[model samples]
Target chain A: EDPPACGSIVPRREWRALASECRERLTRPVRYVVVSHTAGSHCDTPASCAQQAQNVQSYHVRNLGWCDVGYNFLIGEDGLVYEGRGWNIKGAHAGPTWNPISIGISFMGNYMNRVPPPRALRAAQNLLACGVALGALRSNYEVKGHRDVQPTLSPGDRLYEIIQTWSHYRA
Target chain B: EDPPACGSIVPRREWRALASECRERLTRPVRYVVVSHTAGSHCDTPASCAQQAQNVQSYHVRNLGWCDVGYNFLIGEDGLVYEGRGWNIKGAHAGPTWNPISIGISFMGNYMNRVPPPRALRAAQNLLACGVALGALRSNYEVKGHRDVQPTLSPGDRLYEIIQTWSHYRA
Candidate 1:
């Protein structure tokens, strides 16, 4: 039996991420989890997904001038979760209002017309379970689409529909 | 003692406010208060302040397409507090993160260079006390300047300094 901490999460080091300068911390047992999409290319293999994660981090840090990547976690098609801000840090994924109160988890590809692979969805669910088990998220945490909280088509059309069916999701 | 409720606040009817279309309600006993400045004209007399309140509401409604004046309350240099969204409804003043969790009170004048008169400050203090007394805000509610939270120099230089001196003000 493996140690039941965070479930198969790839650390920032594994992706070769730059040192994050972000300092704001999220309050423990956050009440909300916002699901989003990168609207970018997808990668199914481990190597490719790691590269994609680095690309996203660089874009947010270098291009957007953020301290680091915006999401608390990024789901990969390879069936893994890549750490961004992780459990304790505040993310930039949602707008100012939801960002402070919610954990943001983004898929590594667009899900407007297409949905993420089954493994990717499973990875996200497993990540949520881990968050709750570790006491990083409340037992009854709410899940919301990026669109539900802000004026964007993020998490996209197909993915949004799927998340709405989740037990924790609230409109 | 006039019943120990909401202080001498100018109700919407007295200010001739338009019917608000907003429907979102804030969870009561709110923990935060955001202080902002109109960054517009100032009015000292009661009649001028009422007209100014109307002008501000019109701009937010007719031009910006907001439900009503964005603030929960508007402070006037005439030593009065004018109701905008009041205590029950969430105001659009503090962006998405703060609007649902905090009461927004904006001064009806640009405070970037000059501070409001002593009477205006006193009226704002009275309004805060009333909010706590009415159980609309927490007794330990934190006050934050617009500039401290959002990306604008609102509640401006002179006024921001004054608010920082208030017992409830927080960085």
Candidate 2:
């Protein structure tokens, strides 16, 4: 399943509210965060694509078999945040072996076509920092794209470049 | 440019002799050794490809912009060695930035479409060990496919898998 819209602000206050509910259902702590993109899909305009992608992702995650989006968070083109699988449960986004111990976060867009908008990239950095602060992620927990885990190029070249740049971002 | 075709045992021995002459021209201590494949070309058969590829690579390096090919050594599918750009002078294969500090090695066939013959794989390993002994390369000098450097995928997936498997074969 996909994550929520990128525009939604998932601050500490809201996260606290969400965490209380998630704790009741899950049994493990999230240790890593997998950042990925829905590569290959096209939207008419960057804005329309980001907005619509968010909705489609949310619909699949919430109404689909898992009863929630597969990712713990989603960042849209507008750089808004949307909630997804929540923090407590294991995310289905990462590889089967790593999913149980990690939080999955996805960005909406095919990076090979173009670079990710700066706004979206900044939001992702912020979101990662937030995750770290909540103790849901480790200080040395790696931030990797799906391609790094497996052979398929889920994130396109442009996005991969952006990820490389982000590799140095603190938190 | 590519290496010249030095035929069977005698030719290969002659090529090695030529390489020794070339290696005598070096001015600095060589460091990293990079292994790459010449993708997109066909050798007709694994054996033929190995021989021809080694020859072509040797020619390419000896004549690299000046007089000879650019690699420190060349390995073929038949598991034989061919003379290349010589070990002493900097190579042009890895790129100008990396050339001065490293020894570049190349295999003949495009492993992306065809599997490297066992002989070729073994030959590369043996040659790499020899390179370590000569102090022309470090055990951790980074074993990378040409694709890792430039944009194009020169070495194919099949060969790359072998490269990955043997990545830690430190001398």
Candidate 3:
């Protein structure tokens, strides 16, 4: 569970392309875009950072078979977005029954070690805003951590605590 | 998960020995005894019945590191009590963390697959009564199916429904 490198950016047009693909194929309305932070990587190590990012990307494509990553989108430490499994096909990231109706999003850093860089946080907020505009998500779509669905020490305690504090940022 | 064989019995003295051993080792007060039917064996096959009984016995020892079976006792299809993991030690049978505070009792058969012979049910009731007499259990010690703690297609829908109809059962 290494965190992905920060600063590597994916263009907005490309991000929109992936989202549109999801919109076309999805049979049900996307009600939520769940967010998860892989809070294991130590930010000081560049190698660990890159490896974490690659690991998350590989997890989405290989262990879980999808066009690309299972998340609708991913944010890296560099505050850049990485396109993941295209949108319309449904994500395999959430719990078994919730996948078809929600978009999965992940940030590729262990924010539990330290707060996410301002750039990365901004990028996630922007990406979530895009989801809201697309009509695929509601302003009130619940933003939740992986721990909410099952019992496991996941999404890290620190990162989850931060997410809880920022509930006022959106519905 | 097999049912106990017909006509097998555990002497009351031996059952008491196991229960006393458990009481001495476990840290928490044993509050409830969770009951389950293995749903893997039938009464007609003695070898299968014996193997199933042994499997249940060994599983508790190996997995939980208990001296013996984790359940306060076991009931066979033959409507007899068999000494299990003992009464006082914590059981590892339940999936969630609460299992350590509770006792686990399993019958060696898939009662859901076939009607639990009336003898088996009566034996279970008798064992339950014995557990009540131990005087260490909570005044409201409950009898329940394994599925109450987590979601699994277990303990059979029909059997669970029937067990629920009895006011003595909980969960």
lDDT of 1 by residue, B1-171 (tens): 556776988899899999999999999999999999887789999899999999988877885567878899999999999999999999987777789999999999988789899999999999999999988999999999985665345787899999999999877
lDDT (Cα, tens digit) per residue for candidate 2, span A81-160:
65666666665565454567676777766675687677777878887666656656665667666545432244566776
- The pairs that clash in candidate 1 are A97-B96, A97-B97
Model 1, span A6-67: residue lDDT tens: 66999999988999999999998899999998867899988999999999888778755678
Candidate 3 local lDDT, B9-63, one digit each (tens):
5643433332223443554345666766654565534444455566665544554
Regions of candidate 1 where Cα sits further than 4 Å from its true position: A1-171, B1-3
lDDT of 3 by residue, A74-119 (tens): 6677666666654566765554445667777777765545667777
Error of 3 at A45 (Å): 42
Report how far residue A2 has shifted in candidate 1, in Å: 51
Q: Which window of ten consecutive residues has the lowest lDDT sum in model 1 chain A?
A: A147-156
What DockQ would candidate 1 receive versus the native complex? 0.07
TM-score of 3: 0.42
How should the candidates be ordered by TM-score, best one leading? 1, 3, 2
Best by DockQ: 1
RMSD, candidate 1, Å: 12.4
Stretches of candidate 3 exceeding 4 Å from the true structure? A1-171, B1-29, B44-51, B59-70
Model 3 - which docking category?
A: incorrect
Error of 3 at A73 (Å): 17
lDDT of 2 by residue, B68-164 (tens): 4455666666667655665566665655445666777777656766787777677777766665555555655667665454322446677776776
